[PDB]
């Protein structure tokens, strides 16, 4: 899907650029500049106002999603999440940070579930998507003649299509209303409908109406931003209709911004009626104001909140896995876009004239080319930044400063230089955000990032051909080094960019194959065992089974056991070591899964590492609850119903003649354990002789055994393998672990772990007999929240 999807995305973008070139054949870059200058200042204020209103409406859009999801959030939190998710989501789309990914980060702080947020994301997306046909049909149904003239279709055709769409909408509404199950309601404003296979959660009448009213205002507001920037305007009905169709086309095309396809359609519709230059100026300004501007504001706002959090909560925040890294990848990617577009466009004659006297003329040429190569590097380095490489941080920050300098030496492009500097200043402030010391050369290949770069370089060649159309091409142009020669400086830069990008991408893709997964050897198992001993987490003992691969840190103070099943790679617990080592190992595991084209899954993780799992792009799903008794507050002279039941079990066990013995590793009765294991029925001598075995006996004869996970410290201790005979008494087992607890209380262990119950009722009650302290255990899995998949699933179930 990914490769095909990405290819058909690039084609669409490419075809759209061709379309835009043909539609602006009769216009020169002069006429565009004049058209941009022409639009009055009241119109720009009108646009900016309409933009502000149109982004306030999206907050209410976010509120409705929370009501649907049954999520209570503070107003300031909904506001921020509404704005940032819609502002970044609309701009960069899927390429970099998406709407869902923003929502999830932001709304994980308040303890909103991963399921809820997903259901908030889906509702935010689908509600526009599914309203867009209805809104369009209605728009066309006012003044059909104008709509017909705009689309250049027969009046009868567009009439029946609109009617058909409305009728189908009504028929669908009536159908899903038919299967409305009464009684139960997930949220105040929701329904649960049934179709036979799956239950489906739909908004209520009131919420559906309200959402449609919000969607209506939002569209209108957005279309109005464009409508005000047009000197001469068509009837608004037809103009809205077209805008909605262009918007649809942009969405379907899966082009990040909608860029190219949107413009192409608008241009197509109103090529002749309005004229190219006014429309093309309006479309550019519309993009800057309604798309780029709120993105920058959102980016800044999120960086600001990050910076604040670092300033106030200095102690709490340690490893830094927040918003700075994605946001700064975006800004650095935009910085590379600026550099590349700047180069394609010719310079101001006045500036070149004067800068010719300050600089050697042949250095202008050199500066111009180098700036364009740095631009390409900036596009690719954006990935490295996203993955929190310190190398990437340093190299970027150098290239931005050199790029800002060569911006001044090129054509005194002080606007480009100012943007690049400002990006550098931001990137600098967040040095600690990029904390991984991995090599840049070991970043896994990302088709998306390569696809994006190719698009940008494509756009820049489109701009080159448009901006330098006044010159007659010739073979000699390539070798002209003058000052007045602006076209040759474009050409050479263009070729340089394309070649470097091609080279890097080939040098990235044609790389050595990654080594195969192998079970650990004796040395590794011994090194794992060492780490486990000099650590807190005893659950790490399962590593020493030697049936699952071990991934070691560079410092070799930490490791992370995992195993490949099907197309996924399941890690068994959190990494084993300090917080920084844990963060580096989680990133290492992402890297390792990306190199093997496998889905990174983490099994049974604690809540303390959930932000790091968020960082590499996983969602925490509530797997099960792990019960662990506290030995500090546990005493055998206390009172309680369950405590009295336990003391009864204990004393009855002692009177019966049950005895408990502890054997250190190496001196275990292997013959007995084998016989017991066989009677019950991994169990290997190598695995068993790593741990201390507690054996309980009934009147001398061994009645059960259990190996004990334990570290050199006394913070925690667990049990993994534990088998009892069918013929053994029922209270013997309960006596056993009670004996284990007593022994650990004598040794002065802080805590003791029993185990995890998933979702079992009998096991849950049995654990609850000791009155333990519960703690949630999560599962980490990738975030598969594609609107299209969900809509296709809904449509399939409905049909």
Ligand X SMILES: CCCCCCCCCCCCCCCCCC(=O)O[C@@H](COC(=O)CCCCCCCCCCCCCCC)COP(=O)(O)OC[C@H](O)CO
Site string for a second copy, 332-371 (x = CB under 8 A): ------------------xx-xxx-xx-------------
CB proximity list for 496: less than 8 A, separation 6 or greater: 369, 372, 373
Instruction: Tell me whether residue 435 or residue 559 sits nearer to ligand X (CB atom).
Output: 435
Span of 329-337, 490-498, 600-608, 638-646 interacting with ligand X by CB under 6 A:
329-337
36 binds, among ligand X, a second copy, none (CB under 5 to 8 A by kind): none
CA distance 309 to 217: 35
Contact call for residue 401 and a second copy (CB under 8 A): yes
CA distance 73 to 660: 53
431-450 residues near ligand X, rule: CB under 6 A? 431-432, 437
| 64 neighbors 210 (Cβ within 8 angstroms) | yes
280 binds, among a second copy, ligand X, none (CB under 5 to 8 A by kind): ligand X
Site string for ligand X, 365-404 (x = CB under 6 A): -xx--x-------------------xx--x--xx--xx-x
Instruction: Tell me whether residue 53 or residue 422 sits nearer to a second copy (CB atom).
Output: 422
- What's the CA dihedral at 227, 231, 235, 240 to 10 degrees? -20
Instruction: Tell me whether residue 213 or residue 408 sits nearer to a second copy (CB atom).
Output: 408
Instruction: Tell me whether residue 61 or residue 227 sits nearer to ligand X (CB atom).
Output: 227
Site string for ligand X, 284-303 (x = CB under 6 A): x-------x---x-------
419 binds, among ligand X, a second copy, none (CB under 5 to 8 A by kind): ligand X
| 698 neighbors 725 (Cβ within 8 angstroms) | no
- For the bound state, the minimum distance from the C-beta of residue 498 to ligand X, rounded and expressed in Å, comes to 16
CA distance 464 to 487: 8
CA distance 505 to 376: 11
CA-based Rg of the chain, rounded to a whole angstrom?
32
Residue keyed to tokens 């896995």: 321
Contact call for residue 752 and a second copy (CB under 8 A): no
- For the bound state, the minimum distance from the C-beta of residue 397 to a second copy, rounded and expressed in Å, comes to 9
Contact call for residue 429 and ligand X (CB under 6 A): yes
Spatial strand order of the sheet with 199-202 comes to 180-181, 191-194, 199-202
Instruction: Tell me whether residue 166 or residue 307 sits nearer to ligand X (CB atom).
Output: 307
599-605 and 568-571 beta bridge pairing: parallel
CA distance 162 to 141: 7
**Structure tokens that stand for 180 in this block:** 């409305």
Contact call for residue 77 and ligand X (CB under 6 A): no
Contact call for residue 335 and ligand X (CB under 6 A): yes
Residue keyed to tokens 């931005």: 400
Question: Which alpha helices (DSSP H) does 484-602 contain, by range?
Answer: 487-509, 522-533, 579-595
Contact call for residue 345 and ligand X (CB under 6 A): yes
Show the beta-strand stretches assigned E in 637-700.
658-663, 692-698
- For the bound state, the minimum distance from the C-beta of residue 426 to a second copy, rounded and expressed in Å, comes to 13
- Say whether 480 sits in a helix, a strand or coil: coil
- For the bound state, the minimum distance from the C-beta of residue 412 to a second copy, rounded and expressed in Å, comes to 5
- For the bound state, the minimum distance from the C-beta of residue 715 to a second copy, rounded and expressed in Å, comes to 15
Instruction: Tell me whether residue 194 or residue 362 sits nearer to a second copy (CB atom).
Output: 362
| 335 neighbors 423 (Cβ within 8 angstroms) | yes
357 binds, among ligand X, a second copy, none (CB under 5 to 8 A by kind): a second copy
| 86 neighbors 27 (Cβ within 8 angstroms) | no
- For the bound state, the minimum distance from the C-beta of residue 789 to ligand X, rounded and expressed in Å, comes to 30
Per-residue 3-state assignment (H helix, E strand, C coil) for 708-725? EEECCCCCCEEEEEEEEC
Q: Which residues on neighbouring strands pair with residue 362, listed in sequence order? A: none
User: What is the contact surface with a second copy in residues (CB under 8 A)?
Assistant: 350-351, 353-355, 357-358, 401, 408, 412
User: What is the contact surface with ligand X in residues (CB under 6 A)?
Assistant: 17, 20, 260, 263, 280, 283-284, 292, 296, 331, 334-335, 337-338, 341-342, 345, 348, 360-363, 366-367, 370, 390-391, 394, 397-398, 401-402, 404-405, 408, 413, 415-417, 419, 421-425, 428-429, 431-432, 437, 459, 462-463
């Amino acid at each position: 899907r990914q490769p095909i999807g990405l290819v058909f995305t690039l084609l669409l973008f490419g075809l759209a650029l061709v379309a835009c070139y043909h539609l602006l054949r009769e216009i020169d870059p002069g006429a565009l500049h004049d058209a941009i200058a022409d639009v009055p200042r009241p119109a720009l204020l009108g646009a900016l106002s309409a933009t502000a209103l149109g982004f306030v409406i999206l907050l209410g859009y976010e509120w409705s999603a929370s009501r649907f999801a049954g999520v209570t959030l503070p107003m300031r939190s909904l506001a921020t999440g509404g704005f940032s998710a819609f502002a970044i989501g609309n701009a960069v789309g899927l390429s970099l940070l998406s709407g869902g990914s923003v929502r999830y980060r932001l709304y994980s702080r308040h303890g909103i579930g991963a399921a809820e947020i997903a259901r908030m994301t889906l509702f935010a997306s689908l509600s526009l998507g599914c309203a867009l046909p209805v809104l369009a049909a209605l728009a066309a149904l006012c003044d059909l003649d104008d709509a017909a003239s705009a689309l250049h279709l027969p009046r009868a055709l567009v009439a029946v299509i609109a009617i058909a769409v409305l009728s189908l909408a009504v028929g669908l509404v009536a159908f899903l209303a038919r299967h409305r199950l009464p009684g139960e309601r997930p949220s105040p404003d929701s329904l649960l409908v049934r179709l036979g296979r799956r239950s489906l959660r739909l908004p209520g009448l009131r919420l559906s109406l309200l959402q449609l009213l919000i969607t209506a205002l939002d569209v209108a507001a957005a279309a109005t931003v464009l409508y005000l920037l047009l000197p001469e305007t068509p009837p608004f009905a037809a103009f809205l209709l077209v805008y909605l169709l262009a918007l649809a086309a942009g969405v379907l095309s899966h082009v990040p911004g909608g860029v190219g396809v949107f413009e192409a359609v608008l241009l197509a519709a109103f090529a002749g009626q309005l004229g190219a230059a006014p429309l093309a100026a309006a479309l550019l300004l519309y993009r800057l104001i309604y798309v780029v501007l709120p993105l920058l504001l959102a980016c800044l706002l999120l960086l600001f909140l990050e910076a604040r959090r670092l300033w106030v909560t200095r102690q709490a925040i340690r490893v830094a896995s927040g918003f700075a890294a994605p946001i700064l990848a975006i800004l650095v990617f935009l910085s590379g876009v600026v550099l590349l577009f700047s180069g394609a466009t010719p310079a101001i004659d006045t500036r070149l004239e004067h800068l010719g006297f300050l600089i050697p003329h042949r250095l202008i040429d050199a500066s111009h080319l180098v700036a364009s190569l740095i631009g390409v590097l900036c596009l690719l380095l954006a990935q490295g930044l996203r993955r929190r490489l310190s190398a990437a941080w340093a190299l970027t920050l150098v290239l931005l400063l050199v790029g800002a300098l060569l911006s001044l030496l090129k054509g005194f492009d002080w606007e480009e230089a100012s943007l690049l500097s400002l990006t550098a200043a931001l990137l600098a402030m967040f040095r600690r955000s990029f904390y991984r010391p991995s090599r840049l050369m070991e970043v896994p290949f990302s088709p998306l990032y390569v696809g994006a770069s190719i698009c940008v370089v494509g756009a820049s060649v489109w701009l080159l051909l448009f901006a330098n159309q006044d010159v007659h091409y010739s073979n000699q142009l390539w070798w002209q080094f003058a000052l007045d020669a602006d076209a040759p400086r474009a050409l050479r830069a263009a070729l340089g960019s394309c070649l470097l990008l091609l080279a890097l991408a080939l040098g990235w893709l044609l790389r050595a194959a990654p080594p195969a997964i192998r079970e650990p050897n004796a040395e590794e198992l011994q090194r794992a065992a060492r780490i486990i001993r000099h650590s807190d987490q005893p659950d790490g003992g399962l590593a020493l089974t030697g049936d699952k691969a071990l991934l070691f840190h560079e410092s070799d103070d930490a490791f992370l056991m995992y195993a490949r099943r099907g197309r996924s790679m399941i890690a068994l617990y959190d990494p084993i070591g300090p917080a920084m080592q844990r963060a580096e190992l989680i990133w290492q595991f992402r890297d390792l899964c990306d190199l093997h084209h496998a889905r990174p899954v983490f099994y049974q993780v604690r809540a303390e590492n959930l932000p790091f799992y968020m960082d590499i792009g996983l969602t925490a799903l509530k797997l099960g609850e792990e019960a662990r008794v506290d030995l500090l507050r546990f005493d055998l002279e206390n009172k309680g119903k369950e405590m009295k039941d336990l003391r009864y079990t204990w004393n009855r066990g002692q009177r019966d003649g049950l005895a408990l013995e502890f054997h250190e590793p190496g001196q275990a009765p292997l013959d007995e354990l084998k016989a017991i294991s066989d009677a019950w029925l991994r169990f290997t001598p190598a695995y068993l002789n790593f741990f201390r075995i507690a054996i309980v006996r009934h009147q001398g004869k061994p009645v059960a055994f259990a190996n004990l996970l334990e570290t050199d410290s006394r913070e925690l201790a667990s049990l993994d393998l534990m088998r009892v005979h069918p013929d053994a008494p029922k209270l013997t087992m309960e006596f056993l672990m009670l004996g284990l607890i007593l022994h650990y209380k004598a040794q002065g262990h802080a805590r003791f772990s029993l185990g995890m119950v998933p979702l079992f009722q009998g096991l849950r009650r049995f654990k609850d007999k000791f009155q333990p302290d519960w703690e949630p255990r999560y599962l980490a899995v990738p975030a598969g929240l594609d609107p299209l998949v969900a809509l296709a699933d809904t449509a399939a179930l409905i049909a």
